[PDB]
A paper describes a structure:
Here, we report the isolation of a novel protein from Methylomonas sp. expected to be a putative enzyme based on sequence similarity to ketose 3‐epimerase. The synthesized gene encoding the deduced ketose 3‐epimerase was expressed as a recombinant enzyme in Escherichia coli, and it exhibited the highest enzymatic activity toward l‐ribulose, followed by d‐ribulose and d‐allulose. The X‐ray structure analysis of l‐ribulose 3‐epimerase from Methylomonas sp. (MetLRE) revealed a homodimeric enzyme, the first reported structure of dimeric l‐ribulose 3‐epimerase.
d‐Allulose has potential as a low‐calorie sweetener which can suppress fat accumulation. MetLRE is the first dimeric l‐ribulose 3‐epimerase identified to exhibit high relative activity toward d‐allulose.
Numbering used by the authors:
A (entry chain A), B (entry chain B): 2 to 287
Write the structure that this text describes.
């Protein structure tokens, strides 16, 4: 495992629907302006990013970067189609290479399956293939000082693991020192028996955190018990990335946004949303 | 409005994944054993139901019945395909006919669209088509002394309306005396700004309630603020059906369960779950 620090990040889609040269500048300037330690770049297509341009922007605004992604049908590492697993491995290697080039140390999100709504439950083979793929990815990432954090998401976004408890059982089959649990308050709000159980169970295996309101809008205007969740992080003295994550129809990534079913306009002002979110988080943690 | 009374029901999928002679009896016996006033039949294919058999079962167990359903792609009344909208009209008419033959008074659930994930946001055409289909259904239902209740569901299950406030605007566009809002605590837990606002706004327009835990499991083992929700119902003196709704991989309807992404086992003992649920509800609204 590679060093983790308590640091606060903003998800790219708070600012930019695309990672164009302009999109990258807007989002990096945005996160820096709001007082975030890092930007979390969504690498659903890790070939599209101009890596040298982004590195220059990170230097220019004195900002760090981590990376999240979700696979697609074409790159689903759970697939019993070996060719599809191989495309997944390839995308995950490229995502790792981009992260390393940007000086990042965390590759997180739905990296262990296709992000979206499976029409049926995962077979034993689906899970086994995901475990093996996360073993190959962890081993690849280990050579480049990178930790992987598997994001537990709700039933509409994966059929592999929907609770931190399920994630930990999975991580125990993976059995890699640089593979961690990634929890997200939005997803926890749906799946978890309260906001503390999985955090307490994870302890040092909790490698990465997403802060999202129940509707993914303004923090504290929804149903997420943040009092409970932040008390739990304290009880294990969590010291790792915490990125604010929010999706509004105002800022749209043609794939990610429709996959995430973001039908509603829950905000318009990126800077106001991100500014208030960071104040909300730091008032309750750190 | 056709008569509504404060009464408690169990959703069929608490007991049975099919509506065969054996499945119908298992669900109706289960509801009766737990002391529910009614069973809610999941009528996703209303041509499947043996109506005489079910009517006999309802007599045998001294139980009333309401029906919920979700449309599918082939019967989507939001569709810009007039043949698909027509198929929707036909299925909802058949559903109404079944409910009428069972002496039921409530057709509820996702009757206004295809239950599931849409590839993009609903157009004003999609919504207009839905409102007009719900007008036609309400008028057909009214001839048979049946109320319809529009169930607001989360972003992964509809693009038409995800909050009670959105539900009420759709409802008033329908503009029919026997059309009502249907709220579900599980969906509210995701989309709503607290558990009171939509209920207080709805008042007499709220015609049907589903009680589901955040994870659709045992009541009071999740994240739903039931205290706030039940306080709000009291404020508006809600006197309508209240269905306990829960899904576990323990009991599978091979269509509905997969559509609802029930990957996890949240319970194994139907009678324990249903019994404890009713006690939980009557303790807070009895
Ligand atoms: O919560 C999420 C999706 O619902 C994750 O943050 C995303 O899958 C991913 O991180 C986006 O890049
Ligand atoms: O909660 C629901 C689905 O998530 C609705 O009640 C269902 O679509 C339907 O009513 C089940 O029959
Ligand atoms: Mn997340
Ligand atoms: Mn429901």
């Amino acid at each position: 495992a590679f060093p983790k620090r308590l640091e606060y990040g903003g998800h790219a889609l708070v600012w930019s629907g695309d990672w164009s040269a302009a999109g990258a500048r807007k989002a990096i300037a945005g996160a820096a302006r709001a007082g975030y330690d890092y930007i979390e770049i969504a690498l659903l297509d890790p070939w599209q990013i101009d890596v040298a341009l982004t590195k220059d922007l990170l230097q220019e605004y004195n900002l760090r970067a981590h990376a999240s992604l979700g696979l697609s049908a074409a790159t689903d590492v759970t697939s019993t189609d070996p060719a599809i697993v191989a495309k997944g491995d390839e995308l995950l290697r490229k995502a790792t290479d981009v992260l390393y080039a940007l000086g990042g140390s965390e590759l997180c999100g739905v990296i262990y399956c296709a992000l979206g709504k499976y029409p049926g439950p995962a077979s034993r083979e689906n899970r086994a293939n995901s475990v093996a793929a996360m073993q190959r990815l962890a081993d690849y990432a280990a050579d480049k000082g990178i930790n992987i954090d598997l994001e537990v998401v709700n039933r509409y976004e994966t059929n592999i693991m929907n609770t931190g408890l399920e994630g930990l059982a999975f991580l125990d089959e993976v059995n890699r020192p640089n593979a961690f649990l990634h929890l997200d308050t939005y997803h926890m709000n749906i799946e978890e028996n309260g906001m503390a159980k999985s955090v307490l169970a994870a302890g040092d295996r909790l490698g990465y955190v997403h802060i999202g309101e129940s509707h993914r809008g303004y923090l504290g205007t929804g149903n997420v018990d943040f009092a409970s969740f932040f008390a739990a992080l304290k009880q294990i003295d969590y010291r790792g990335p915490i990125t604010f994550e929010s999706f509004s129809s105002e800022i749209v990534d043609p794939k990610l946004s429709n996959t995430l079913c973001v039908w509603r306009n829950l905000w318009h002002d990126s800077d106001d949303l991100a500014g208030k979110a960071l104040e909300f988080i730091k008032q309750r943690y750190g």
